[PDB]
A paper describes a structure:
We also revealed that the BAH–PHD module represses the release of Pol II from TSS regions by cooperating with CPL2, a known plant-specific Pol II carboxyl terminal domain (CTD)-Ser5 phosphatase. In this model, the BAH–PHD bivalent histone reader recognizes H3K27me3, and unmodified H3K4 marks and recruits CPL2 to dephosphorylate the Ser5P of Pol II CTD, resulting in the inhibition of Pol II release from a transcriptional initiation state to elongation.
Overall, the AIPP3-BAH domain has a classic β-barrel structure that is similar to other reported BAH domain structures. The H3K27me3 peptide has a good electron density map and a β-strand-like extended conformation. The peptide is captured by a negatively charged cavity that is formed on the surface of the AIPP3-BAH domain with extensive hydrophobic and hydrophilic interactions. At the N-terminus, the H3A25 forms two main chain–main chain hydrogen bonds with the AIPP3 Val140 and Glu142.
Author numbering:
A (entry chain A): 119 to 277
B (entry chain P): 22 to 33
Write the structure that this text describes.
Amino acid sequence: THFNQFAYDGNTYDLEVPVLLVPEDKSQKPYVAIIKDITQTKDGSMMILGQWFYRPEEAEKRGGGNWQSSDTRELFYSFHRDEVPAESVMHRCVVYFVPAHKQLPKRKNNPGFIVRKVYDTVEKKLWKLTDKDYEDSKQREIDVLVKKTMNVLGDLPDL
Amino acid sequence: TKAARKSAPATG
């Protein structure tokens, strides 16, 4: 049993939108994840499939270190997916997928996270939004997210 | 308000 939306605490959440989630460990920052699926378990609890975002300081580098966030708003997308309870959502947030050619939006205009990289968890490396390393479906996912960001931000101030 | 747990995937 799958759902296209789910309502909790007075807020309705659709598919393919970023949300903040209460972290597993208390000391962690609130997790950020894209909603990919809304399902109901056998026992009736509602779980959402989420595609994680990785903060540059927590994403492991191959060399064993961590990345330096260029901007406070920087997040790494990924393909790491996990089923988390629907009651764990805090609220919907804003995440902007802006390609390398276009420059970032201004902070006071549109506040929220910005994504310029995608974190490869297997090889522990970063992929650009458009890259030959992607498979067809993963490049399609990244293109869908970039397009959804573009329908919001019309102007493309190039560097 | 349950919490969300992140799995640890197999990496290189």
